[PDB]
Design a protein around this ligand. Structure first.
Ligand SMILES: Cn1nc(CN2C[C@@H](C(N)=O)CCC2=O)c2ccccc21
Ligand SMILES: [Zn+2]
Length: 140
């Protein structure tokens, strides 16, 4: 579990979104595993606007933050799971690191702010859904 809170927006994994998020939906994309809803209170996270490929992510299944190198956002085949059939997921970045399904939502951050959230993984890899291209999260 986990979410990003920026301005009047809440960013979560689409597969973990609540009734309130769908009722207050701003934007969602199944192919990205992302959902953005509106909030009443202002959030304090800053979204990174950069091309960093190194950062730190939180891994709940180890209660640890790991420094990682990660690939650029791309279209990657993701195996079937409880929440999606086997499909290509877009804007996904991979790293060598530990992850389990319940680690989704863990933040990946660089020196500029939040880069994305854990979304995929398996066999010593961890995948993060990028949020750096969603420029509108910084305004309105
Ligand atoms: C973080 N993560 N995730 C999954 C599977 N998965 C993919 C997710 C997706 N984005 O398509 C949907 C939820 C889910 O359970 C997984 C398996 C094994 C290890 C680490 C893992
Ligand atoms: Zn950065």
């Amino acid at each position: 579990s986990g979410a990003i809170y920026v301005g009047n927006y809440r960013v979560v994994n689409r597969h973990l979104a609540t009734h309130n998020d769908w009722a207050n939906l701003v934007w969602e994309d199944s192919s990205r595993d992302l959902l953005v809803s509106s909030t009443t209170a202002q959030g304090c996270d800053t979204i990174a606007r950069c091309d960093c490929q190194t950062g730190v992510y939180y891994c709940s299944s180890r209660r640890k933050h790991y420094p990682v190198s990660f690939s650029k956002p791309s279209l990657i085949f993701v195996e079937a799971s409880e929440y999606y059939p086997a499909r290509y997921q877009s804007h996904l970045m991979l790293a060598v690191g530990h992850s389990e399904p319940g680690d989704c939502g863990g933040i990946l951050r660089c020196q500029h702010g939040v880069v994305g959230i854990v979304s995929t993984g398996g066999n010593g890899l961890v995948g993060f859904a990028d949020v750096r291209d969603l420029l509108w999260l910084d305004e309105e």
